[PDB]
Amino acid sequence: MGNRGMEDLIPLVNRLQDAFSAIGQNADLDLPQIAVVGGQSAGASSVLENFVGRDFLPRGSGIVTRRPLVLQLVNATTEYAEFLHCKGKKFTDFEEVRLEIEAETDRVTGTNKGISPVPINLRVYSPHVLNLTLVDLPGMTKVPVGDQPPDIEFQIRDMLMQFVTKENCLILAVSPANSDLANSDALKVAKEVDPQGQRTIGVITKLDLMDEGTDARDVLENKLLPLRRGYIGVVNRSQKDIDGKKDITAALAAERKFFLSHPSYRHLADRMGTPYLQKVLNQQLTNHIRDTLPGLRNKLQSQLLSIEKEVEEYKNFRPDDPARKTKALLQMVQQFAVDFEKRIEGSG
Amino acid sequence: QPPDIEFQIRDMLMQFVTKENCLILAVSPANSDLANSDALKVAKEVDPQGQRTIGVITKLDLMDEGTDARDVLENKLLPLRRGYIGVVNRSQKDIDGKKDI
Ligand SMILES: Nc1nc2c(ncn2[C@@H]2O[C@H](COP(=O)(O)OP(=O)(O)O)[C@@H](O)[C@H]2O)c(=O)[nH]1
Ligand SMILES: Nc1nc2c(ncn2[C@@H]2O[C@H](COP(=O)(O)OP(=O)(O)O)[C@@H](O)[C@H]2O)c(=O)[nH]1
Ligand SMILES: [Mg+2]
């Protein structure tokens, strides 16, 4: 478990914040939010929790993500979690967090596969995290089931648009490997909000459920459908694994063996896996934080220039200074005589 | 393929399933959530009452270990008037292996 690529980026945020906080101003470290987009049963929830590094989300077959979950990571001296609707309560075990998520979902949506556009806000504190916003959205569908109205498609789409048309947001498009990539819904959305692929990152899931004799080699090599940032293959847990409480360590080891042994993927074994997706995202934050430094320097540079002309004199102040008093006297008298002539004569 | 490939293919479907004296076979794999099928959405829009539509489930040997399609084959998840029929075809390895029908 855990995400150790944050450690190299936490102090940079602290140092810059301490730099501005001393002057009574805050640092515009507007780190982007990460939205996970995909279709029903694509694997989005499994992907997202691997970036957080904690096992707390609900996952499995069926419509499990019935409400948008917004996770806010906050740097803190101790690790704990809390909800907005459980004010005054403290969560010290993520299993309780997962159960609360299901309970809060059913209380509003019912049990017959309902949805609700009102999100759930989870705030996890920890010393090993940045101040990040992570969004876990419901998957998209075509036809209603259970109590879903005829317009279930568009209600889900609007929930999606509110979080992906927002600037400064990484779109993490997850698609299954055992379905034709031309018929993925994630990529249809990405190419409508991010035409040039500057934000979009593709993930290919379910590489271990391919039909025998077929592979995704022309996908992971960015040949079938060119994507600016390429595709990353991942092998998450199976539904049996979820119900079997399979450990994370075993899942990662199996993912490593898979890519190292599959004949069509060995030459890409180092571009794929859970840890590589962490590295790409972390590197994506680091590029953003370092791309904003020029603005911060210019702000401080402008302020010094404005203040410098006066503090040059204040720093040399001595109360016993006849020269200052007489210089002040000549300035006041010259100001009065100019103001006086202005009002009477019209000069100036 | 131009940007409007989606609506060019759809306009071809709407020339054969938008008329009477026609049966429609809604084909969809079983290794994906049935709620996301494009076959049913088209059939439901053209044949709301399910008079003509018949559902087919094509890939039952490719389902993730630990689940099954009973909720569909028993016409419970998305009840369809004429039910659903499950089939198991030749894999890609078999097509290239010259396996007899
Ligand atoms: N074996 C395997 N199972 C997967 C993979 N990706 C997703 N699944 C399964 O697909 C189901 C759906 O997972 P989930 O992410 O909750 O779908 P979601 O509704 O999009 O969140 C789960 O049972 C996962 O175990 C994969 O790469 N390999
Ligand atoms: N293993 C397996 N493969 C299947 C099954 N049904 C279809 N396929 C595969 O589906 C692939 C494409 O089928 P096809 O009918 O051409 O899809 P189409 O583009 O709609 O015609 C073929 O390679 C088949 O081997 C199945 O039940 N099991
Ligand atoms: Mg989900």
Side-chain angles (χ1 to χ4, degrees):
Chain A
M1 306 294 288
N3 180 335
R4 290 162 182 75
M6 296 294 183
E7 300 299 307
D8 299 337
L9 181 51
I10 288 165
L12 298 177
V13 171
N14 286 344
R15 292 178 65 188
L16 293 177
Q17 287 175 337
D18 289 339
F20 281 91
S21 63
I23 65 166
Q25 304 172 34
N26 197 14
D28 293 324
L29 303 177
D30 184 5
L31 296 180
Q33 75 185 22
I34 302 170
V36 186
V37 182
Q40 170 65 15
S41 298
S45 297
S46 294
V47 172
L48 181 57
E49 69 173 343
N50 287 330
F51 179 58
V52 172
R54 295 288 188 272
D55 186 340
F56 63 106
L57 293 181
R59 59 187 187 277
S61 59
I63 304 175
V64 179
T65 300
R66 292 183 291 279
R67 292 185 65 189
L69 175 63
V70 177
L71 172 61
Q72 184 177 2
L73 300 174
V74 177
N75 192 278
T77 62
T78 182
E79 183 173 338
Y80 66 93
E82 66 176 1
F83 294 85
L84 286 182
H85 67 282
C86 298
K87 181 178 180 180
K89 181 176 174 63
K90 179 179 181 180
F91 294 75
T92 63
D93 183 2
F94 281 101
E95 291 298 337
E96 190 183 21
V97 176
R98 185 179 57 82
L99 297 172
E100 181 65 16
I101 295 163
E102 294 177 348
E104 176 60 14
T105 304
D106 292 331
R107 187 187 67 79
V108 178
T109 60
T111 59
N112 194 17
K113 302 181 174 66
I115 61 159
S116 178
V118 178
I120 297 171
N121 297 96
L122 172 57
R123 184 173 296 170
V124 178
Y125 295 82
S126 175
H128 298 286
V129 300
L130 302 174
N131 298 334
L132 289 172
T133 297
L134 307 172
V135 183
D136 186 4
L137 297 175
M140 287 167 284
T141 63
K142 267 56 164 177
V143 294
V145 301
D147 293 342
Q148 298 175 358
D151 64 337
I152 186 65
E153 179 183 8
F154 295 93
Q155 291 183 14
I156 296 170
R157 182 177 182 83
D158 289 0
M159 288 191 290
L160 178 60
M161 291 300 95
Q162 283 188 341
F163 293 92
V164 302
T165 63
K166 179 184 182 179
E167 184 52 289
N168 193 35
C169 176
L170 302 178
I171 305 172
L172 190 59
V174 188
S175 297
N178 65 8
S179 178
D180 196 322
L181 193 69
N183 199 35
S184 182
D185 298 312
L187 302 175
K188 181 182 173 59
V189 171
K191 294 185 181 297
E192 290 181 358
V193 302
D194 192 11
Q196 299 304 317
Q198 298 296 308
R199 306 178 278 167
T200 311
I201 300 171
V203 179
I204 300 298
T205 64
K206 304 180 183 183
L207 292 178
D208 53 332
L209 301 176
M210 300 298 294
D211 179 43
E212 185 177 358
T214 304
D215 64 2
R217 187 178 179 179
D218 57 355
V219 178
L220 301 173
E221 290 187 350
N222 191 40
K223 299 179 180 178
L224 181 58
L225 185 60
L227 187 63
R228 168 61 179 83
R229 294 186 177 279
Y231 298 81
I232 303 169
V234 297
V235 175
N236 308 310
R237 286 187 187 95
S238 69
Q239 182 63 62
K240 179 178 181 180
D241 300 318
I242 296 165
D243 295 335
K245 299 182 180 180
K246 186 174 181 180
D247 189 1
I248 194 67
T249 301
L252 293 173
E255 186 173 51
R256 189 58 174 168
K257 291 179 178 178
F258 175 86
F259 285 110
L260 292 177
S261 295
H262 195 294
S264 297
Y265 301 136
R266 285 197 298 268
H267 67 285
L268 301 173
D270 294 328
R271 288 177 52 196
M272 300 180 295
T274 300
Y276 186 84
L277 180 56
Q278 292 184 352
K279 290 181 181 177
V280 174
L281 284 177
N282 293 333
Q283 183 65 47
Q284 189 62 53
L285 296 171
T286 299
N287 299 343
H288 177 79
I289 196 167
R290 290 189 178 275
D291 278 9
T292 58
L293 291 175
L296 299 180
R297 285 197 298 271
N298 288 343
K299 289 181 185 176
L300 293 180
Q301 186 63 50
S302 176
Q303 292 181 45
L304 286 176
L305 291 176
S306 177
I307 294 169
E308 187 175 63
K309 60 183 178 288
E310 300 183 19
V311 297
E312 184 64 10
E313 303 168 353
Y314 291 149
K315 70 186 193 183
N316 297 324
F317 181 92
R318 302 291 186 277
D320 184 7
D321 188 356
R324 182 183 62 258
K325 297 173 180 298
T326 63
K327 185 178 70 174
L329 182 57
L330 178 62
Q331 289 299 309
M332 298 293 94
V333 173
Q334 289 180 6
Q335 284 179 8
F336 177 85
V338 172
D339 195 64
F340 181 82
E341 183 178 57
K342 177 188 72 173
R343 298 181 179 279
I344 307 298
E345 302 292 347
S347 177
Chain B
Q1 298 169 301
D4 63 320
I5 190 67
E6 182 181 5
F7 296 93
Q8 290 180 5
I9 293 171
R10 182 177 180 84
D11 286 1
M12 286 192 290
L13 292 174
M14 299 295 96
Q15 302 307 315
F16 300 90
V17 300
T18 59
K19 62 182 181 181
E20 68 283 8
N21 192 34
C22 174
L23 302 180
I24 303 167
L25 298 183
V27 190
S28 72
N31 64 352
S32 73
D33 190 311
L34 184 64
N36 196 24
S37 174
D38 292 312
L40 298 175
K41 179 180 177 62
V42 175
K44 186 67 177 175
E45 286 182 5
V46 302
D47 191 44
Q49 298 178 25
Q51 301 174 358
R52 302 173 275 165
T53 305
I54 302 172
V56 185
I57 304 302
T58 52
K59 307 185 187 182
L60 303 175
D61 48 328
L62 302 174
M63 291 191 69
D64 175 50
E65 181 179 359
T67 182
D68 60 65
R70 290 179 64 187
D71 299 338
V72 181
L73 298 171
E74 296 179 357
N75 200 34
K76 294 184 178 178
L77 175 60
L78 185 60
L80 198 156
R81 179 168 171 179
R82 295 175 180 278
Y84 293 93
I85 306 166
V87 303
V88 177
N89 302 326
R90 288 171 285 178
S91 67
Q92 185 65 51
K93 180 179 182 178
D94 298 327
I95 294 171
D96 296 326
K98 304 298 181 181
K99 185 176 181 179
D100 190 83
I101 188 169

